Amino acid sequence: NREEKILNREIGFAIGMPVCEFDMVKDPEVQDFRRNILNVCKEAVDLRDLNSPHSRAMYVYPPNVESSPELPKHIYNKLDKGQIIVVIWVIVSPNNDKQKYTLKINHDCVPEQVIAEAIRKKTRSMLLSSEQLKLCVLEYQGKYILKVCGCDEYFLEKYPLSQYKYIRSCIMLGRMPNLMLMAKESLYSQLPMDCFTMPSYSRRTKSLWVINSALRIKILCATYVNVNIRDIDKIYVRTGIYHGGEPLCDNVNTQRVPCSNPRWNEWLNYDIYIPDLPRAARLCLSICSVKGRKGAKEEHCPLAWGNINLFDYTDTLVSGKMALNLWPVPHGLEDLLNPIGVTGSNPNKETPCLELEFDWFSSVVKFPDMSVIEEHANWSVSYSHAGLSNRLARDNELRENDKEQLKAISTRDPLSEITEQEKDFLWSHRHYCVTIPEILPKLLLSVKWNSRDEVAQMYCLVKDWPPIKPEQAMELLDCNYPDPMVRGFAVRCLEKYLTDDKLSQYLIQLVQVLKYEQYLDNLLVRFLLKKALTNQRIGHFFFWHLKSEMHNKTVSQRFGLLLESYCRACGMYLKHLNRQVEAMEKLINLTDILKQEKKDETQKVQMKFLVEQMRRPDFMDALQGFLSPLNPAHQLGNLRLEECRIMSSAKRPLWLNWENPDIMSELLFQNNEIIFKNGDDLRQDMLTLQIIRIMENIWQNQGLDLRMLPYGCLSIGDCVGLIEVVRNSHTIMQIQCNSHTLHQWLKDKNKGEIYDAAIDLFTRSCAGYCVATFILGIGDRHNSNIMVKDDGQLFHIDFGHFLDHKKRERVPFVLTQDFLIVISKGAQECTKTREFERFQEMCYKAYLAIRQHANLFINLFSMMLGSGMPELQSFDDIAYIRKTLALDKTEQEALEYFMKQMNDAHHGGW
Numbered sequence: 001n002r003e004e005k006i007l008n009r010e011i012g013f014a015i016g017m018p019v020c021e022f023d024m025v026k027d028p029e030v031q032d033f034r035r036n037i038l039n040v041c042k043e044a045v046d047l048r049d050l051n052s053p054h055s056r057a058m059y060v061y062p063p064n065v066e067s068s069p070e071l072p073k074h075i076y077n078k079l080d081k082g083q084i085i086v087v088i089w090v091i092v093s094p095n096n097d098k099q100k101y102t103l104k105i106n107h108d109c110v111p112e113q114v115i116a117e118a119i120r121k122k123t124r125s126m127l128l129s130s131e132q133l134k135l136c137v138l139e140y141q142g143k144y145i146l147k148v149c150g151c152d153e154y155f156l157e158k159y160p161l162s163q164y165k166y167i168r169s170c171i172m173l174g175r176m177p178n179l180m181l182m183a184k185e186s187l188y189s190q191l192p193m194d195c196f197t198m199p200s201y202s203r204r205t206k207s208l209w210v211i212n213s214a215l216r217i218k219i220l221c222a223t224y225v226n227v228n229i230r231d232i233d234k235i236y237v238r239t240g241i242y243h244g245g246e247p248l249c250d251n252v253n254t255q256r257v258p259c260s261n262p263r264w265n266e267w268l269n270y271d272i273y274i275p276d277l278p279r280a281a282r283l284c285l286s287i288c289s290v291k292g293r294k295g296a297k298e299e300h301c302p303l304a305w306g307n308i309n310l311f312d313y314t315d316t317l318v319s320g321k322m323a324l325n326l327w328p329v330p331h332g333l334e335d336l337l338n339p340i341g342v343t344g345s346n347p348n349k350e351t352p353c354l355e356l357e358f359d360w361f362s363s364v365v366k367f368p369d370m371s372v373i374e375e376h377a378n379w380s381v382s383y384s385h386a387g388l389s390n391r392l393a394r395d396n397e398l399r400e401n402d403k404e405q406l407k408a409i410s411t412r413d414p415l416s417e418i419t420e421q422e423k424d425f426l427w428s429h430r431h432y433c434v435t436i437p438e439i440l441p442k443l444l445l446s447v448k449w450n451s452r453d454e455v456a457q458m459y460c461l462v463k464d465w466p467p468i469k470p471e472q473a474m475e476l477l478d479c480n481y482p483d484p485m486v487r488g489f490a491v492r493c494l495e496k497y498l499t500d501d502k503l504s505q506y507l508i509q510l511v512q513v514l515k516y517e518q519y520l521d522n523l524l525v526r527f528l529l530k531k532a533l534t535n536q537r538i539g540h541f542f543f544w545h546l547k548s549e550m551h552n553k554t555v556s557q558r559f560g561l562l563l564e565s566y567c568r569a570c571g572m573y574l575k576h577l578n579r580q581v582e583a584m585e586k587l588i589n590l591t592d593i594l595k596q597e598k599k600d601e602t603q604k605v606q607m608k609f610l611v612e613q614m615r616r617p618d619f620m621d622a623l624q625g626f627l628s629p630l631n632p633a634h635q636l637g638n639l640r641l642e643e644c645r646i647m648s649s650a651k652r653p654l655w656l657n658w659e660n661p662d663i664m665s666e667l668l669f670q671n672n673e674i675i676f677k678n679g680d681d682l683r684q685d686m687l688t689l690q691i692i693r694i695m696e697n698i699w700q701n702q703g704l705d706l707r708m709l710p711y712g713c714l715s716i717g718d719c720v721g722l723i724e725v726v727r728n729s730h731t732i733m734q735i736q737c738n739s740h741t742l743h744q745w746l747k748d749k750n751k752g753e754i755y756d757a758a759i760d761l762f763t764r765s766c767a768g769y770c771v772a773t774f775i776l777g778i779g780d781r782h783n784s785n786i787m788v789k790d791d792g793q794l795f796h797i798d799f800g801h802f803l804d805h806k807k808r809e810r811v812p813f814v815l816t817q818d819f820l821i822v823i824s825k826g827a828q829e830c831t832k833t834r835e836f837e838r839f840q841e842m843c844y845k846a847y848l849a850i851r852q853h854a855n856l857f858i859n860l861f862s863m864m865l866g867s868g869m870p871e872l873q874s875f876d877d878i879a880y881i882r883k884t885l886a887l888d889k890t891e892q893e894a895l896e897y898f899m900k901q902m903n904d905a906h907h908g909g910w
């Protein structure tokens with residue numbers, strides 16, 4: 001009753017729009033989504049209440065683990081004969097006195113085995129229990145749990161110690177793991193009971209194939225089409241029928257009419273049989289203007305665009321009158337139509353509005369059931385008669401050359417052109433294609449989607465199609481694959497094989513491809529919502545990725561409604577998310593004042609204003625005692641205003657410092673430092689840092705310890721976000737305060753026997769960033785955007801642009817003599833040294849490794865075409881990595897290409 005109203009106010013604060021605004025949406029799909037999605041909410045809540053309190057603690061503090069338990073050979077070599085030295089802390093009695101217990105145990109020990117050994121070492125002091133029964137009431141390993149010292153990360157599940165990311169990181173970085181022994185009931189009491197209630201809104205024919213007609217759509221008239229009548233002569237509505245991004249028939253234009261009276265009243269006839277309309281078929285249209293002329297070819301220009309699903313969410317072929325409010329053209333539309341554009345009516349009703357009428361067949365026309373589709377596919381099945389079409393092959397028509405040809409085709413990258421010969425070939429051998437499952441994306445593109453006979457047969461292949469790798473399945477969720485049977489199969493592969501580690505890794509892409517879904521309620525959204533509601537680490541980022549796009553009206557409805565369903569069932573975390581949302585709001589409003597009102601003032605004056613505004617009661621309270629949106633395991637305690645400052649970077653970002661209120665903060669970090677940036681789109685850096693992380697993981701598995709630094713970056717809104725401060729790091733320019741300056745600095749920071757490890761870490765990190773930046777075509781490097789850690793770890797910051805941002809393949813990271821001197825340990829002939837030869841071998845090995853995983857990187861960029869990133873608008877942008885990775889060329893030709901690009905950039909050496 002009263003509790004619903006309170007919850008509605010909390011959800012409203014979280015999503016940035018009131019819940020009541022969803023209640024007033026008349027669209028039945030919106031109301032059905034809101035109602036129907038609640039079953040995912042029920043399901044998720046039940047799984048959390050299954051084995052309470054542990055199942056609830058597993059939701060709140062899920063194990064931060066690697067996908068595979070298996071440790072690479074060079075990582076195992078860092079261990080002392082397969083054993084790890086672990087420190088276990090116990091907070092005991094008054095004065096909260098900390099007591100450490102250092103243990104030497106097998107890397108694959110279960111946390112309960114780790115707890116047992118710690119209590120044995122604690123008990124060892126009492127030499128009485130030591131001899132007779134060392135157990136001490138079965139060491140009550142079930143009465144305690146291990147927590148990471150300095151952050152809210154627990155070891156609640158039976159995994160091997162080394163599989164937990166904190167431990168693997170400790171091994172790799174040569175750091176001592178510090179864990180805190182905590183009583184189970186101390187954590188369980190912190191965990192509040194989940195009181196999920198259903199909202200008040202929870203309470204509230206002929207077949208397509210029996211229509212022997214071609215498709216017709218009526219264009220009536222347009223309103224709100226205001227244009228300079230002195231400039232423009234006439235206007236017209238351009239239309240087309242599409243399956244995803246590809247047309248199913250030729251485009252049909254209306255008659256040209258003067259803009260003073262846009263009233264066509266024309267029935268446009270399409271070259272498509274109504275039964276041949278695929279499930280995902282859409283009407284794509286646009287209002288264009290035509291003028292000119294100068295005696296030269298006419299001047300066409302799109303004014304506004306709009307896309308419609310030819311079938312509604314209930315499988316009903318759209319009928320009757322319909323009005324579509326159009327969208328404004330985005331810069332760089334290489335056609336008069338925008339089929340990759342969002343399907344639907346513009347929420348702003350004071351925009352061009354085209355009135356349409358569809359056909360009516362004296363009955364509700366519905367898309368056929370799978371029983372009708374199966375029967376038709378089975379029905380669609382002499383020796384020489386198969387020879388009449390290159391698109392069909394009979395019983396035993398699979399040669400050994402053709403089998404190897406299909407294998408060769410499946411290897412090729414997603415951006416590789418499949419010829420029409422290859423499309424007929426793939427389709428004719430579709431039944432053999434089942435034996436090579438990974439070929440599915442190629443075979444699907446070979447289908448004639450404007451043929452019900454082919455599509456029905458393809459549907460039966462997809463039904464009994466063997467599972468493919470999650471990474472291979474993700475391609476099938478991009479814009480190229482609109483069919484629900486194909487997309488449904490892809491979601492089913494992720495449900496079965498995607499680990500929560502990998503889901504967290506690829507969550508940005510999965511959130512993006514939701515935008516390519518025809519309907520609000522689909523298999524993908526249900527999959528992602530259930531995962532977000534059964535894992536709070538996933539849920540946190542699911543919330544922020546959706547919230548960061550709420551300002552974009554192309555996705556605000558879908559994302560708003562999805563966020564509402566999330567908030568209604570996430571539990572206690574809503575209260576915590578709201579603290580973060582308010583904290584961000586105060587930082588946005590404060591930085592907005594500094595960019596608008598106080599921009600033309602000195603740092604002393606600006607800082608005076610910052611300090612005064614921060615010390616305000618409402619501000620102080622809002623901005624302290626919340627969880628870092630960058631990593632919600634990090635508690636941000638009280639602000640250290642003396643350590644906070646306005647940065648000298650443009651867009652004047654705030655450098656913020658909070659106390660870490662963890663009892664063992666000293667063993668991780670006492671102060672949490674974050675850069676709040678207002679002015680830059682953080683999405684490009686977010687995707688680059690994700691790719692860097694993936695590249696590093698590839699190299700590590702292959703046995704190349706090339707340490708990268710994919711620091712934390714999170715977009716929280718329209719050109720607003722957070723950036724992780726890398727501790728003990730400085731830019732090359734701030735080091736230079738000659739060529740030996742950098743090497744001399746690292747020598748002083750790493751004196752004695754540690755020197756050789758610092759040079760090694762420098763060379764290795766340098767090699768990783770050299771390869772990564774060249775492949776990705778990152779923005780040009782310089783002394784202010786290259787940083788070095790005290791230990792010697794080199795890394796880059798502020799990516800900004802990737803791929804061909806110039807608009808012939810650049811080398812962003814040119815190694816000056818400064819870097820080569822450090823590499824060669826202070827040598828005269830920097831080129832001809834064993835240290836440089838070692839360094840080159842690292843770059844070559846790293847280059848080829850990424851070449852082998854090319855399909856993943858192409859696919860991660862492809863799924864990202866949905867977001868409005870300026871340098872990632874078409875598949876031609878993505879094609880830059882086809883060039884840098886030299887995919888058309890051979891492996892030896894690729895090394896020669898890489899060597900030549902490095903040779904030309906550095907003026908010799910390679």
Ligand SMILES: CC(C)n1nc(-c2ccc3oc(N)nc3c2)c2c(N)nc(N)nc21
Nearest residue numbers: 675685723724725726727729731797798799
């Ligand atoms: C002091 C300054 C040179 N700086 N800038 C950044 C940074 C600031 C803004 C950024 O924007 C992007 N995209 N990467 C960025 C990196 C950064 C950082 N992360 N860590 C440390 N210790 N110092 C940093």
